């Protein structure tokens, strides 16, 4: 089998992650059509339709039946390199594949970074608010 770390590159792995995905047969954003776009299902309490590009880590919720996952992905993360891979996985070379996996690694850090930033900003809003009240 394939090393687990590499599995999300596989459409069949990504599809398998959709458990209790509301949008099925008649819909445009089926698990299959979603995995083909690079998403995996990663639901929460307050965001049960949450999905994520495995490659650029863009997160989208609030899906609708007529949502074309590829169209939604291009709009929200036009920079996503996976969007550009026209070749089939087994048709790739290790070289190509190794370069791709590298760009993943970076995207992941940049995402980890952007998150850290957002959490920072939320703290600071709490910090300012607290000082203003303490001055009044």
């Amino acid at each position: 089998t394939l090393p687990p770390a590499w599995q999300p590159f596989l459409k069949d792995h990504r599809i398998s992650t959709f458990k209790n995905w509301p949008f099925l047969e008649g819909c445009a954003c089926t698990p299959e059509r979603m995995a083909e776009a690079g998403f995996i299902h990663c639901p929460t309490e307050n965001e049960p339709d949450l999905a994520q590009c495995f490659f650029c880590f863009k997160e989208l919720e609030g899906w609708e039946p007529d949502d074309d996952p590829i169209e939604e992905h291009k709009k929200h993360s036009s920079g996503c390199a996976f969007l550009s891979v026209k070749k089939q996985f087994e048709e790739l070379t290790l070289g190509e594949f190794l370069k791709l996996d590298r760009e993943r690694a970076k995207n992941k850090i940049a995402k980890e970074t952007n998150n850290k930033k957002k959490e920072f900003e939320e703290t600071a809003k709490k910090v300012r608010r607290a000082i203003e009240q303490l001055a009044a």
């Binding site: 954003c29 949450l50 863009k58 997160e59 989208l60 919720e61 609030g62 899906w63 949502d67 929200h76």
Partner: peptide
């Protein structure tokens, strides 16, 4: 689709 909305963003988180």
């Amino acid at each position: 689709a909305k963003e988180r």
